Amino acid sequence: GLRERKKTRTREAIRAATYGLIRQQGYEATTVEQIAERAEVSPSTVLRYFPTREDIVLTDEYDPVMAAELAARPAGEPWSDSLRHVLRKALGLGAGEEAELIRLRTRLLAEVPAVRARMLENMSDTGRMLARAIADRTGLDPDGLEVRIVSMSLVGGLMEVSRYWAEHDHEESLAELVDRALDALENGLPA
Amino acid sequence: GLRERKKTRTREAIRAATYGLIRQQGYEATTVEQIAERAEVSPSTVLRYFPTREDIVLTDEYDPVMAAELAARPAGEPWSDSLRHVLRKALGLGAGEEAELIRLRTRLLAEVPAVRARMLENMSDTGRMLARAIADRTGLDPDGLEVRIVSMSLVGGLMEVSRYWAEHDHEESLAELVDRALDALENGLPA
Numbered sequence A, B: 001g002l003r004e005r006k007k008t009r010t011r012e013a014i015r016a017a018t019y020g021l022i023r024q025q026g027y028e029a030t031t032v033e034q035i036a037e038r039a040e041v042s043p044s045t046v047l048r049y050f051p052t053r054e055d056i057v058l059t060d061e062y063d064p065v066m067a068a069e070l071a072a073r074p075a076g077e078p079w080s081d082s083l084r085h086v087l088r089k090a091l092g093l094g095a096g097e098e099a100e101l102i103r104l105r106t107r108l109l110a111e112v113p114a115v116r117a118r119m120l121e122n123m124s125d126t127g128r129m130l131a132r133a134i135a136d137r138t139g140l141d142p143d144g145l146e147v148r149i150v151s152m153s154l155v156g157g158l159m160e161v162s163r164y165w166a167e168h169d170h171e172e173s174l175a176e177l178v179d180r181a182l183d184a185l186e187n188g189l190p191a
Helices: A004-025 A032-039 A043-049 A053-057 A063-071 A079-091 A098-111 A113-122 A129-138 A145-168 A174-187 B004-025 B032-039 B043-049 B053-057 B063-071 B079-091 B098-111 B113-122 B129-138 B145-168 B174-187
Strands: none
Touching: A004 A032, A004 A043, A004 A053, A004 A098, A032 A043, A032 A053, A053 A113, A063 A079, A063 A129, A063 A145, A079 A098, A079 A129, A079 A145, A079 A174, A098 A113, A098 A145, A113 A145, A113 B113, A129 A145, A145 A174, A145 B145, A145 B174, A174 B145, B004 B032, B004 B043, B004 B053, B004 B098, B032 B043, B032 B053, B053 B113, B063 B079, B063 B129, B063 B145, B079 B098, B079 B129, B079 B145, B079 B174, B098 B113, B098 B145, B113 B145, B129 B145, B145 B174
């Protein structure tokens, strides 16, 4: 019954271990086994919480995290600037070494189709939390089509940018690519 | 050396079997084993060609099929009507019992997250053929960001529609949902 917070505290320690190990030693050098030890937790506890290591990577999950970022604007802010806010943050733009960890997840997205594969299977099976937050601030039907289209389209926008940054870093920053992405999502189709 | 066409002819017979069995007996009643026999082919031939049954479902693959549909417009047709064409076809709108088979794949997309899961993993790992065909007819950079955003956004549009149709068929046809989808993709973000 203080079980909903031994639960999260252990999820978080596994999250922190795996991130910690990836910085030092790269993704594939990171074994679940190595992860338990560092989280000071059994291997079957990791598994039970995170079926694959991709799942640990995608714990700060996108949809719920971009949704909350958007609900909590909460500024009577135009749409364009809420969308700039949430997409920059979701990709790891900003001060914070919390931004720094997010940026690493942005690179994994590009380097690991296993990670990009999973974020992709993740990527249907919901959340509709982001869709529901777009509806609040546009007033649209929360369960309607339009908002699911926009939401898929932002989630797959963030994924295209992160793939594109990894191949074009020498010539474009993450930041200007985000600007390009937002522009295309807001104005692109035309005709 | 008539190996590139025993190859396709066998791919096609497996495709036809599996479609055939699904109509009669539903998806899960369809075993790879049942599939070999009907295709009159070994079980390990199916596997070697299609790792999972989801792969057989997604053989007429979306990206290459929507790309070719778009390249081959080839009508100096406005953008909006090429996009209406290709999305209607991709979902199974049109005369043809070829349309009828496509519609079944549209229903599987909604009913089988295993199928929707796989079309989703499929769904990063490329094709960029659709992206390349959007570039021809907009003149955009074929390897640029903008065209990858638009393409992801149409592919995930078609997937949202097909999910939405399955829950809203009694009140909306596939066809008017496509119209809703195209409208949102063309005009929606606004603000």
